C-alpha cells in the first residue's frame, strides 16, 4: 500500500506564504489513474477541497482559493506541493494531501498536518508529572504552555496503550495551550514497572520523556 505524508511549518504568519509538501512512498507519482489532491478541514469550513494536480502538471483549483493557490508536482522526488499566499486566520486548518482516483474517490489520505495562522512565535511545552495518589492507580502527564497545536503523547514509546486517555488541548487565558494525558495501571506494578510519557511538539521540535514516579 501507498502512504502519503505531509510536511511543512505548523505555524505561519499572516500575509506570508503557506508551503506544504506531500511525500508519496511505496508507489510512483507518475500514474494516469490518480489526481494528487489537497484537502483542508477546520471547524468553520468543514472538509474543503482545495485542488489537485495531474502528473502531467495540469491543475484544477477551488474557485474560492483560486487567487492564492499554487500546486506543483516533482515526479523525480515523488512529491507534490501546496503554496497558499496571502494567508488569513480563516486559513488555519488541518491540511491533508490525498490520492484521488480519476474515477472520483479519495482512497488514500495522509495523516494531515495542522497549520495555524498567527503572529506569535512557537513555544515548546513544559511537561510535569501527575504522580499516583494510591485497586487500580491513575497517573498522568501535564503538557502546558505550548503553541501552536498539536502535541502528541505516548506512554513507554507506544508499548502502553491500554487504559490511556489523552485529552483535547485546552486554551488558557495566556493564549497558550495545555494538554493532559492519563493512564490507569494496577497498583501492584508501580514498584516493578517504570512509566514514561513521551511528549512531542513538532512545531518547536520539542521531545520530552518525563518519568512518573510514586
Amino acid at each position: 500500500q501507498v502512504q502519503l505524508q505531509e510536511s511543512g511549518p505548523g505555524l505561519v504568519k499572516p500575509s506570508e506564504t503557506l508551503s506544504l509538501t506531500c511525500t508519496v512512498s511505496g508507489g510512483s507519482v507518475s500514474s494516469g489513474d490518480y489526481y494528487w489532491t489537497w484537502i483542508r478541514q477546520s471547524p468553520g469550513k468543514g472538509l474543503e477541497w482545495i485542488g489537485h494536480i495531474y502528473y502531467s502538471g495540469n491543475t484544477n483549483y477551488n474557485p474560492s482559493l483560486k487567487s492564492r493557490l499554487t500546486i506543483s508536482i516533482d515526479t523525480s522526488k515523488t512529491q507534490f506541493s501546496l503554496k497558499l499566499s496571502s494567508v488569513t486566520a480563516a486559513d488555519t486548518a488541518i491540511y491533508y494531501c490525498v490520492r484521488d482516483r480519476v474515477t472520483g474517490a479519495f482512497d488514500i489520505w495522509g495523516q494531515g498536518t495542522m497549520v495555524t495562522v498567527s503572529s506569535a512565535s512557537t513555544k515548546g511545552p513544559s511537561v510535569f508529572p501527575r504522580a499516583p495518589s494510591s485497586g487500580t492507580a491513575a497517573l498522568g502527564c501535564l503538557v502546558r504552555d505550548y503553541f501552536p497545536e498539536p502535541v502528541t503523547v505516548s506512554w513507554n514509546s507506544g508499548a502502553l496503550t491500554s487504559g490511556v486517555h489523552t485529552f483535547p488541548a485546552v486554551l488558557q487565558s495566556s493564549g497558550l495551550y495545555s494538554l493532559s494525558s492519563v493512564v490507569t495501571v494496577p497498583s501492584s506494578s508501580l514498584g516493578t514497572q517504570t512509566y514514561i510519557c513521551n511528549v512531542n511538539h513538532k512545531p518547536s521540535n520539542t521531545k520530552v520523556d518525563k518519568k512518573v514516579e510514586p
Binding site: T103, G104, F106, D107, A131, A138, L142, S180, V182, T184
Partner: protein, 212 residues
Amino acid sequence: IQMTQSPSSLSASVGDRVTITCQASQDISNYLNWYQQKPGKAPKLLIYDASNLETGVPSRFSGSGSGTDFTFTISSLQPEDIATYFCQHFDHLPLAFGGGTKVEIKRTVAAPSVFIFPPSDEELKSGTASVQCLLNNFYPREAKVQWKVDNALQSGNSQESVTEQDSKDSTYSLSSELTLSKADYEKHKVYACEVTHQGLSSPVTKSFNRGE
C-alpha cells in the same frame, strides 16, 4: 452543489440498524462517495459510486440512491463504528463534502472512577499550580464537576476537557483542571472535587490537604 446531510447527529445502541441521508442541491447521478472519520484521524473511504463497497470495508456498510437523495446504512452498529460520516460528490468541480453526521453510541449508564491530583513540586516551582480531577470511563457524557477550596465554591478558574467516545467500551473520560498561581494556591489547605453523574446515586467528593 450544496450537500445536506441528516441528521446532524444520532445516538444508537450496539447492533442497531443506522441509516443517514445526504441531499444534493441538484442531480449528481451516482457520483457520490461516503467517508468515515474518527476523531484525530483522516477520513476513510467506505462507499464509492453511491453503492459500491470499498475493498476491505466490512459488509455491514452499504449505500444507495440516485439523482439527489442518497442513503448510508450500517446494518449492525459495532462499538468501533462511532465516527462522523460524510458524503462527497464528484459531479463537477469543485468537489465538495456534506456537513457530516456524527454517529454516537448509547450504552448502559456507567459511573466514573474519580481521581484527584495535587500539583507536582516542579510545577509549583515554575510559578503555577494545576489541580486535576479525573473522571474515568463513564456514560453518559454529561457530568458536573464542582471545585471547592476551603469549602468555597469556585467559579471561573477551572477548565474541562472530555475525550471522544471510546471505540471499545463506548465510555467517556473527563479531566477538570483548577488553575491557580503558586501564591493563591498556598493561601488554602483543602482542595476538593465534587462529581455529580447519572451513574452515582450521590455526588462523589475527592479531596486532599495541601502538601500530601
